[PDB]
């Protein structure tokens, strides 16, 4: 233990080649601090009376919980103080946040400060999702800098407040998992260069929406339960927190689905701070992420609170579902 491979060392070491201003390390160091603070609050939320609602609703019409506010505040303050950012997009804010000139750095950060709100009060896994872009424009920073396609991401990932707290970080050459050591408050590298299985045996979707599903999703699910070739049926898992279901998809393989449906043309999940970050992790792990008709990372957003269908995970599973959409087109 006298040689600790922390997230900071990792993001410093591997990136010494391309030099750079080093504000990405500043950025990620800052975000780790917010994530530790959120993790600590979550782990004692009931004793600190942090369960319940804040008394408000956000642009996508969610009921804001107390932990939403706390986590939102923590993430915004640390990112600003990092001197690495210029434009911030949060699920909890109607408009992009523009950093004050004095603290401006070159990155644009889209994040969900707390994901899995329906699972807060029952103590199921929740998390934090983020995607990071380089501001391209030369003009004054604005909400427009956030409206980039996911393929432009330079870094993305999530923190998972599960049985242990994990920071999953994807960058151009790959995905790596860091676990929070609660004793020293450091994120330690525990899974290097993570890759997803080509084919899994778990499917993950809320089948409560069966009555609204399109024929392709309907057929796909029926095929998981009754395989035509006599293989064993897939097992089902749906934690109900995107970070938990996506992380399982990553480390066990399989598919996660939040598709469009008869009442929700664009699905539910948010493109900027939910879908794109997870699509990027998946793609860097050798996985795929599709709306059913097009790659999530290639969508050019027009609304920072825009929704998108998303189907992701093991390439052979996701490809199987795409063939069914193509067959139905
Ligand atoms: O209750 P539903 O419609 O299955 O929504 C679950 C999804 O909603 C979210 O909480 C986003 O609001 C995700 O974390 C999760 O994947
Ligand atoms: Mg969420
Ligand atoms: Mg949220
Ligand atoms: Tl959502």
């Amino acid at each position: 233990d006298t040689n600790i491979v922390t997230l900071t060392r990792f993001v410093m070491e591997e990136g010494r080649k391309a030099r750079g201003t080093g504000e990405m390390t500043q950025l990620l160091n800052s975000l780790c601090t917010a994530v530790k603070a959120i993790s600590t609050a979550v782990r004692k939320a009931g004793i600190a009376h942090l369960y319940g609602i804040a008394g408000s609703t956000n642009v996508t019409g969610d009921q804001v919980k107390k932990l939403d506010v706390l986590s939102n505040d923590l993430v915004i303050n640390v990112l600003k103080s990092s001197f690495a950012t210029c434009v911030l997009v949060s699920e909890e804010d109607k408009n992009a946040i523009i950093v004050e000139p004095e603290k401006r750095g070159k990155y644009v950060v889209c994040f969900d400060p707390l994901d899995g709100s329906s699972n807060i009060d029952c103590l199921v896994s929740i998390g934090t999702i983020f995607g990071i872009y380089r501001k391209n424009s030369t003009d004054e920073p604005s909400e427009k800098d956030a409206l980039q396609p996911g393929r432009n991401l330079v870094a993305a990932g999530y923190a998972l407040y599960g049985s242990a707290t994990m920071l999953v970080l994807a960058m151009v050459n790959g995905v790596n998992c860091f676990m929070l050591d609660p004793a020293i408050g450091e994120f330690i590298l525990v899974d290097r260069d993570v890759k997803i299985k080509k084919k899994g045996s778990i499917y993950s979707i809320n089948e409560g929406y069966a009555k609204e599903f399109d024929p392709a999703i309907t057929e796909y699910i029926q095929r998981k339960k009754f395989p035509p070739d006599n293989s064993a049926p897939y097992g089902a898992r749906y934690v109900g927190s995107m970070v938990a279901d996506v992380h399982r998809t990553l480390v066990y393989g399989g598919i996660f689905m939040y598709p469009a449906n008869k009442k929700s043309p664009k699905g539910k999940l948010r493109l900027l701070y939910e879908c794109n970050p997870m699509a990027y992790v998946m793609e860097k792990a050798g996985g795929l992420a599709t709306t059913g008709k097009e790659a999530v990372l290639d969508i050019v957003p027009t609304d920072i609170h825009q929704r998108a269908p998303i189907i992701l995970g093991s390439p052979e599973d996701v490809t199987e579902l795409l063939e069914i959409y193509q067959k139905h087109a």
Side-chain angles (χ1 to χ4, degrees):
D1 197 79
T2 55
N3 176 72
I4 325 80
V5 187
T6 67
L7 183 141
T8 301
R9 165 153 138 203
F10 191 91
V11 168
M12 295 191 46
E13 256 165 43
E14 193 196 88
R16 234 261 233 276
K17 238 27 226 273
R19 328 181 271 156
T21 72
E23 32 199 298
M24 171 67 76
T25 302
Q26 298 165 204
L27 202 273
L28 289 169
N29 272 353
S30 297
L31 186 62
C32 281
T33 293
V35 170
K36 282 178 317 169
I38 295 163
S39 181
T40 302
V42 166
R43 265 54 156 103
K44 69 186 185 211
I47 288 299
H49 308 98
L50 301 178
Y51 292 138
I53 85 163
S56 68
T57 321
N58 67 21
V59 298
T60 10
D62 288 348
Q63 193 92 159
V64 178
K65 327 284 185 61
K66 294 167 196 153
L67 275 169
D68 281 326
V69 175
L70 173 46
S71 67
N72 194 49
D73 285 345
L74 288 163
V75 178
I76 292 161
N77 289 329
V78 314
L79 286 181
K80 288 181 178 177
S81 71
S82 75
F83 296 110
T85 70
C86 46
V87 177
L88 302 181
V89 167
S90 168
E91 162 187 30
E92 297 317 313
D93 287 272
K94 313 162 27 131
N95 288 114
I97 300 301
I98 313 163
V99 177
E100 91 181 71
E102 160 206 331
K103 292 170 161 346
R104 283 193 193 163
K106 64 168 154 318
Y107 294 100
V108 176
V109 187
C110 302
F111 59 91
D112 176 5
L114 200 57
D115 161 76
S117 286
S118 74
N119 272 324
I120 292 298
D121 289 359
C122 65
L123 271 55
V124 167
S125 299
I126 49 151
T128 296
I129 307 163
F130 61 89
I132 297 309
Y133 293 96
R134 218 169 353 241
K135 166 170 185 259
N136 281 317
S137 77
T138 57
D139 33 10
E140 282 310 280
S142 70
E143 206 169 282
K144 212 204 158 103
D145 290 301
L147 295 176
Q148 305 189 37
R151 56 201 181 209
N152 286 2
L153 284 158
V154 173
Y158 51 86
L160 175 68
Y161 318 115
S163 65
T165 296
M166 188 82 91
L167 203 299
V168 179
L169 174 63
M171 289 176 134
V172 62
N173 309 137
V175 184
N176 295 283
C177 302
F178 304 81
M179 185 173 290
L180 185 268
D181 186 326
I184 60 164
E186 295 287 344
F187 289 89
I188 309 308
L189 177 61
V190 177
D191 302 297
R192 185 193 251 69
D193 211 2
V194 175
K195 304 287 179 198
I196 198 29
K197 290 153 53 168
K198 286 294 174 298
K199 190 191 191 57
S201 68
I202 298 73
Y203 76 98
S204 182
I205 190 21
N206 187 338
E207 297 188 52
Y209 293 105
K211 169 161 70 50
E212 308 299 354
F213 286 153
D214 63 52
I217 289 134
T218 297
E219 183 174 323
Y220 181 75
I221 294 28
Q222 186 69 181
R223 195 180 298 181
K224 301 300 103 197
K225 305 169 170 167
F226 305 84
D229 66 348
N230 277 45
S231 45
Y234 278 31
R237 293 282 191 273
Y238 195 74
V239 173
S241 284
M242 182 200 205
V243 292
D245 288 307
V246 172
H247 187 74
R248 190 194 49 248
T249 300
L250 176 61
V251 301
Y252 288 5
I255 189 305
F256 169 82
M257 300 170 278
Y258 212 122
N261 72 39
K262 289 172 166 46
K263 274 128 186 261
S264 308
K266 269 195 187 317
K268 173 187 182 185
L269 301 185
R270 265 60 115 265
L271 174 57
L272 292 239
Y273 36 87
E274 290 170 328
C275 300
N276 267 159
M278 300 303 206
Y280 182 84
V281 173
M282 265 316 129
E283 285 218 11
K284 295 303 176 163
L288 299 171
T290 177
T291 65
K293 278 139 197 202
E294 76 189 288
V296 173
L297 293 173
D298 286 338
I299 302 163
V300 176
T302 58
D303 173 14
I304 67 302
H305 292 307
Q306 190 178 319
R307 297 183 196 272
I310 184 164
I311 295 79
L312 54 83
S314 296
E316 290 180 27
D317 289 313
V318 172
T319 294
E320 188 184 331
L321 185 42
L322 276 173
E323 287 157 1
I324 302 315
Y325 268 103
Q326 300 169 325
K327 165 170 93 159
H328 283 265

